Amino acid sequence: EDPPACGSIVPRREWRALASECRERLTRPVRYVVVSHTAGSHCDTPASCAQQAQNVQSYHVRNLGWCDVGYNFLIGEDGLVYEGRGWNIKGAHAGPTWNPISIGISFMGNYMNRVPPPRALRAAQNLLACGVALGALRSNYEVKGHRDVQPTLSPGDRLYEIIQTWSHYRA
Amino acid sequence: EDPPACGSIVPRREWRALASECRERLTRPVRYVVVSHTAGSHCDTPASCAQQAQNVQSYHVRNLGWCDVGYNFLIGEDGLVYEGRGWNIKGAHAGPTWNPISIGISFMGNYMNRVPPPRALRAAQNLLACGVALGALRSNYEVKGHRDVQPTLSPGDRLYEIIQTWSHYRA
Amino acid sequence: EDPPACGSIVPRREWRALASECRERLTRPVRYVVVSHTAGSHCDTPASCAQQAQNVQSYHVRNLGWCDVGYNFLIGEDGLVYEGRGWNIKGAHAGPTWNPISIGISFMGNYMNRVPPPRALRAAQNLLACGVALGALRSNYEVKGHRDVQPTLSPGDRLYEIIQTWSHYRA
Amino acid sequence: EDPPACGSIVPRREWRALASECRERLTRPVRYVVVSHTAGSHCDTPASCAQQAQNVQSYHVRNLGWCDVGYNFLIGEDGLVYEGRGWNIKGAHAGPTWNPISIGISFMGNYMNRVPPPRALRAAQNLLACGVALGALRSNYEVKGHRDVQPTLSPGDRLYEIIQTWSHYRA
Ligand SMILES: CCCCCCCCCCCC(=O)O
């Protein structure tokens, strides 16, 4: 009865993230998950994927002036999960309505016309099962695509198509 | 007391807009303009363009349950401006820091891989001068790309590449 | 839609209400909730709170000439919701812009220098969730104070501070 | 930190409850609901019903030596529900055959020559649906009276006839 029976996650340190200055918290257990895509280039090795997480945060903090990278977690095609703001901190990925009540996970890449590789799909689903196991998400949490709550094409046609079949998907 | 022009704006009732539920006001003169794209299909006839203004508002209100189409104005490839929420109503186009202090205009189409036709651009430039002439915009207003204030590809590489050249543009 | 309903509400007859003469319907689902106070005497027991309901309806019907008590629901410090005009009928609580597009709930008493007990707040928020569940309110409904849409102290300095913190609150 | 639980439950600490020491968990969702009376005093205000819940729980804890008040929830004549051991903790209210399979709720007074007011019955029905809504209760649950499962005069003569008229009430 391991108190934390879930998940390999690449932590901030390891992907060389800038220290976060977000303080605003979510309230566990969290009800909604919104799946996005970064919409840039993908990345398929740990060194490449850790670079990409760095660039993303670089955009949100350097350019856009945010307190941290927007997403709670990002999903690489190396098939690891990168800690974004994580389970406890409100992200900025889906507007002032969905942000304080969800967890935004973003796949790194562009899935308009490309599907994530199986290992990235498993990483993402294992990550959700682990949120439930941890009490961070509700046992009956709901998955939305980004496009379901914000006017956008994110998470891309081929990914949208996939998340829709998921156990917890609810539009 | 001088008012001139200046709308060749196509008014909501003409493009068969559903009636807006929004009540929140911008305060004039408005300092900022944010230029997005719909990421959508483009339209080059006053008939398709009216029909697209519908489909775009239909997305925001029916799908997303918003009070109205998120943009203050939209821009067809027909060379006409489409009235959205207009000059005095807060729009929902660039998040909660920029929505209340800006006008958002969006070009109907996806401009990652096309430039909008020059008449589309003349329409947008003439809008903005109208706004100044009305006292809706500050004479020295500033223009931003959507991707400059929010994480997105909007308004498209090509379109973005154009707006960087505008006199009122600002880093 | 559904056999019986959600949440508990003291019915019109139970608080000895005069029959309604109102017929203007609201349009489901409603986007706005406006929270007032009555600035009248407060009460903390089902007996005294029913009495108070009556006195308010009475002032509205007999002195103001309204078809019924202006509020859709009233709220007692006894922790009970009193049925006003209900989910379906247009109230008179927020003036002619807001009355046709909102549900008006009023806490019975004056909340400038005191707060309503946790039980009143709970009942209020409860009511509201039931509104959504019935499909009388939008799921993305927005709460406003009376002072946000009309110039008035209502709902009273201390209660306004409170509703500011509600999830659905948009000034 | 979000909107309160459905049901408008007066939380433990609001009725000045001694802390629970119970830890046997009920496995959701529960099939049976058992209705009892307390046979103690009865109370018609929030003040007097807080106190009465105190007194019942005191009797259970200090005198009988139980981990907490025996009932999952108590119901006041003030029209409120008082959180006992709640949705997730096995109670002690109907003996060892009935406690591990059910949620016990009890009305606070003697219902032999009296009935609880309509508000008290409203609270309870409301509690039970909020049960389902949470996922604590079977969508398709069965309600049983105390005298049906254990030799007793509980829930009184009058209360007991009433609940037999409830829909969910089983033979
Ligand atoms: C999910 C069934 C109906 C939900 C209606 C809203 C009442 C709240 C129940 C959800 C539980 C919670 O918010 O903790």
Please name the defining characteristics of this protein.
171 residues; 5 strands; 6 helices; homotetramer; binds lauric acid; Lysozyme-like; globular; 31% helix; alpha/beta; five-stranded mixed beta sheet
Structure report:
Four copies of one chain form a homotetramer. Chain A has 171 residues and is of the alpha/beta class. Chain A has one domain: Lysozyme-like (3-Layer(aba) Sandwich), CATH 3.40.80.10. In chain A, 31% of the residues lie in helices and 17% in strands. Chain A is built from six helices and five strands; from the N terminus they run H-E-H-E-E-H-E-H-E-H-H. Chain A has a five-stranded mixed beta sheet with strand order 3-2-4-1-5. Chain A is globular and about 35 Å long. Chains B and C meet through loops of B and strand 5 of C. The site of lauric acid (DAO) has 4 residues of chain D, from helix 2. Lauric acid binds next to helix 2 of chain D. It is classed as immune system. The entry lists the keywords Immune response, secreted, antimicrobial, pgrp, Antibiotic, Peptidoglycan Binding, immune system. It forms a tetrameric assembly.
